[PDB]
Structure 1
Amino acid sequence: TTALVCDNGSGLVKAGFAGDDAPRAVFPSIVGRPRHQGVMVGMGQKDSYVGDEAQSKRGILTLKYPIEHGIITNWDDMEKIWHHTFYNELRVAPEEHPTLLTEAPLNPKANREKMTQIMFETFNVPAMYVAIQAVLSLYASGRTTGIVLDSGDGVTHNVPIYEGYALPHAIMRLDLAGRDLTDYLMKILTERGYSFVTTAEREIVRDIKEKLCYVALDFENEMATAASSSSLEKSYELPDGQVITIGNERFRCPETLFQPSFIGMESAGIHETTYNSIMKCDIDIRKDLYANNVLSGGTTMYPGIADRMQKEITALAPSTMKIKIIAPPERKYSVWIGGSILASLSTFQQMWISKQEYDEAGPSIVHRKCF
C-alpha cells in the first residue's frame, strides 16, 4: 500500500515512501513572510513562502521556525509545512497513504494529540503512527542493543536499549542542539568585527558552522596552538564578497556540547550525560551499552566529535573495558532509514491507528495500547 514516511525533525523536513533507503524530499522547515511594501503592480506575490523557496527569497523575507525544541509553537505554519510536503514536493494524495511520524522523547502529550488530530481531520489519512527517533535510529544501524545519542537541531537525547527492551528511567534529554551552537557562533563572531543580526544572516552563520567547524581532541593545547600559529585560520565567501577569516572560533563553537557553561547552561556535556545514562542501567548490561555506542543526528557530524567523545568516555569508564563508538557516514538520514525499514515490515501492519479506531476512541488513542 506504499505507506508514507515523514520526519518533521527540527530545522529540516525529510519525507518519502517506505521501502526506500533515501528521502525523496529534504528542505528546511522554514516559513517566511515579506516585510517590505512592494511597488511593482501585477506580479501578485503570495502572502507566504514555505520551504526551499524561502531560502531563495531569503533577502526579502523574515524566516521563522515553527518549532523551537521539538515542540511545535506555531501550528498554522505546521499545517502549511505538511501541505507543502504532501503536495509540492511528493505530489501525492494523502487519502490513501498511511503516514508514519517521528517524534522526540519526553514531550507534552498535547503535541502528539494535535498531530493525530491534524493528520486525521485535515488530511484524512487512512492510518498513522508516531514513533521515537532513537528506536528508528537503532533500526537503521542494524543493532539490537546499545545506547544511542541523537543530537539534531532542536534537542539532544540518549535512549538506552538492550535486546529490544527500553530503559525509560535512564532516558536523558538535553535541549542543547545546533541552534544554540549557531547562536553562540554569532555571539563569538561579534568579537572579530562581524555582526549577524537578521534572520537571513542566521542561515549564513549556519552555513559557516556547517562548512568550517570541527571538534578538537584537546582544548587547552589547541588554544595554545591557535594563539601562536596562524595555521588554523580559514577564509569564507559571503554571498557578496568581503572575505572573513575565522581563527579559534571554528573549534570553540562545538565545545559547547562538551562545555555547556559557555552559554550559561547548568547541565554537563554529552560525554558525561551518556556515561550517566549508561550507569543508571543495570550492571549486567553495561558492557553491551559501552561497546555499542551509536551516534545519529545532523549535529553529530562535526569532524572529530567521535574521537573526542570516545576519549572522554574512556577517561570516565573503567580501564578494563573497551569503548567503541559507531559513526556511520549517514548519521543525518539514519532516522528516516530506520523509519522506512520499520514501515516496510509486515508485522507492523496491525499496529496502525485506523480511522475507525480513532473515531471510536477519540484523540486520546495515542497513549493506549496502540502507541
Structure 2
Amino acid sequence: IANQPVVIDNGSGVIKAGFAGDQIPKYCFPNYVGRPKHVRVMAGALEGDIFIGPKAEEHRGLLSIRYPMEHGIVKDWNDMERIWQYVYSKDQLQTFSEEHPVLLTEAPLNPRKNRERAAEVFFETFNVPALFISMQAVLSLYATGRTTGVVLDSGDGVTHAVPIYEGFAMPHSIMRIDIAGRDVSRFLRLYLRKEGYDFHSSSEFEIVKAIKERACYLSINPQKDETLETEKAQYYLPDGSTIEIGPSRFRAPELLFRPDLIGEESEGIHEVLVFAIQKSDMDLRRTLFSNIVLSGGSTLFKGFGDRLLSEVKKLAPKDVKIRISAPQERLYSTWIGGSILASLDTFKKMWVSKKEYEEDGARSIHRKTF
C-alpha cells in the first residue's frame, strides 16, 4: 500500500506512535486518561471531560489520573479506545485510521482475550486496512541489527526475557513476571510514607514516578549498603518543598531483583534472564549468554548493568563470557524495531487484511501472531 503503515508501541507507562521509516517516534505521550476531579464554575475553563498526553501533563494537578492497562493487560477498554483515538487526532500524527495500516506491539504470554479485543477495536471502531500484533523482544533485535540475542525488556507494566537464536524465537523458554517499573514506583510510595512524606493522590503518584527516575541507584552489594549510614539526598517537589529520601532511594529498585520485598512468590529479574537461557537447549546457552540485549525504560536505573552482570555471573556456569549490550535509546528501541519491520516488503505478507479478519474472525489474528 502507498500510504505508510503506522507503528503503535502500546506500552503500559508510555505509548509511542509514528509512521514507518522514521528513525525515532515523533509523537510519544504518557499512557493515562485524565478526568477533572474539581468542579467547573467559570466560563472559558478547559473544555472536555477527557485529557490525554501533553494537555494532561500541563494540567496534571487539576485531573485525576487513571491507567487503562496494568501488567500488560488492558483492564478498561473504553479508556484504551480513547487513547488510540487520541493517537489519530490532530494533536499527534493527524491522519485517518482507514488509509494507514497499523503495527501493534503487545508483551509476550499475555491473555488470548486481550489480543482478540485489541483486534476487534482496531478493525470495527477504526476501519484499518491491516493489523499485525508482534512481540516487543522480536522488534528490539531488528533495531540493534542482530539475529542472535536474549532480550530482557523491563517495561513499566511487565518485565520479560525472550531467547531468540538466528531469527527463531523459542516459545517454551519465554519467561514473564508481573513485577516491573510501576510496582517499583508503588513500592517507593510505601517507603516514602515510612520516611514520613504522604502521596495518596493519583496526581501525586506521578511525582513518585518522577522521584524514582531522577534519584534511585541499584547498589552492587545489597546487605553492605543496608548497614552503612546513607547521605540523605534532598529532592525538590513541584510546589518547592524539599524531601530527604535517605535509605528508600536504593531499597526501592531492589524489588526488580528480589520480588520477596513486596511479597510476591516470583523469580527476580536476574533469575528470569538465566532461567530463559538455561531452559534453552545445551548448544545455544553459550551464544545466548554472550548476546544479552537490555530493553524497556526500567533498565535505565543507575547501576542496573553493573548489578545484573554481578548477579547473572553467580547463577551462570563458571568461565562463560557474559556480555550485556545496551542500545543508547533503550526506551525507544522496541518502536524503532517496529519501523524497520514495517518498512520491509515481507511485512505485506505478514499483515491480516480486513476481509481475512471478517471471514475467519478471532482465529486469523491468533494464527498469524507469535
Q: TM-score range by the shorter chain?
A: over 0.9
Q: Deviations over 1:222-275 (max 9, x none)?
A: 2233x1x53xx3221111122112212111111011111110011231111211
Q: 1:43, CA displacement in angstroms? A: 4.1
| Closer/same/farther in 2, CA of residues 369 and 13 from structure 1, 3 Å limit | closer
- Secondary structure, in 3 states, of the residue corresponding to 1:26? strand
Question: In the aligned structure 2, how far is the partner of 1:115 from the partner of 1:132?
Answer: 14
Greater alpha carbon shift after TM alignment, 156-165 vs 360-369: 360-369
Question: In the aligned structure 2, how far is the partner of 1:44 from the partner of 1:208?
Answer: 28
Contact 2:134 2:369 in 1 (8 A): no
Task: Give the aligned partner of residue 203 of structure 1.
Answer: 206
Q: Deviations over 1:265-289 (max 9, x none)?
A: 1123111121112111100000001
- Secondary structure, in 3 states, of the residue corresponding to 1:120? helix
Task: Give the aligned partner of residue 53 of structure 1.
Answer: 55
Task: Give the aligned partner of residue 81 of structure 1.
Answer: 83
2:155 matches 1:152: yes
Q: For the aligned residues, what is the CA RMSD? A: 1.4
Contact 2:31 2:83 in 1 (8 A): yes
Task: Give the aligned partner of residue 266 of structure 1.
Answer: 265
Q: 1:42, CA displacement in angstroms? A: 5.3
Contact 1:353 1:370 in 2 (8 A): no
TM-score by length of 1: 0.96
Question: In the aligned structure 2, how far is the partner of 1:370 from the partner of 1:254?
Answer: 33
Task: Give the aligned partner of residue 314 of structure 2.
Answer: 315
Q: 1:136, CA displacement in angstroms? A: 0.6
Task: Give the aligned partner of residue 251 of structure 1.
Answer: 250
The percent of aligned pairs where both chains have the same amino acid is 54
Q: Which runs of 5+ in 1 are unaligned?
A: none
Residue type at the aligned position of 2:78: D
Moved over 6 A (4+): none
Paired residue for 1:39, among 32, 38, 41? Answer: 41
Paired residue for 2:216, among 206, 213, 217? Answer: 213
Paired residue for 2:125, among 97, 106, 122? Answer: 122
Question: In the aligned structure 2, how far is the partner of 1:12 from the partner of 1:327?
Answer: 20
Task: Give the aligned partner of residue 297 of structure 1.
Answer: 296
Task: Give the aligned partner of residue 105 of structure 2.
Answer: 102
| Closer/same/farther in 2, CA of residues 44 and 25 from structure 1, 3 Å limit | closer
Q: Deviations over 1:87-139 (max 9, x none)?
A: 13111112211110001111121111111111111111111111000101111
Question: In the aligned structure 1, how far is the partner of 2:116 from the partner of 2:267?
Answer: 32
Q: 1:344, CA displacement in angstroms? A: 0.8
Contact 2:154 2:299 in 1 (8 A): yes
Contact 2:277 2:285 in 1 (8 A): yes
Paired residue for 1:64, among 40, 52, 66? Answer: 66
- Secondary structure, in 3 states, of the residue corresponding to 2:176? strand
Task: Give the aligned partner of residue 343 of structure 2.
Answer: 344
Question: In the aligned structure 2, how far is the partner of 1:267 from the partner of 1:368?
Answer: 30
Task: Give the aligned partner of residue 161 of structure 1.
Answer: 164
Residue type at the aligned position of 2:105: T
Task: Give the aligned partner of residue 335 of structure 1.
Answer: 334
Question: In the aligned structure 1, how far is the partner of 2:270 from the partner of 2:369?
Answer: 34
Q: 1:350, CA displacement in angstroms? A: 1.4
Residue type at the aligned position of 2:276: S
- Secondary structure, in 3 states, of the residue corresponding to 2:114? helix
Question: In the aligned structure 1, how far is the partner of 2:175 from the partner of 2:369?
Answer: 24
Question: In the aligned structure 1, how far is the partner of 2:206 from the partner of 2:256?
Answer: 20
2:89 matches 1:90: no
| Closer/same/farther in 2, CA of residues 38 and 369 from structure 1, 3 Å limit | closer
Contact 1:294 1:325 in 2 (8 A): yes
Contact 1:214 1:254 in 2 (8 A): yes
Q: Which runs of 5+ in 2 are unaligned?
A: none
Task: Give the aligned partner of residue 19 of structure 2.
Answer: 17
Residue type at the aligned position of 2:67: Y
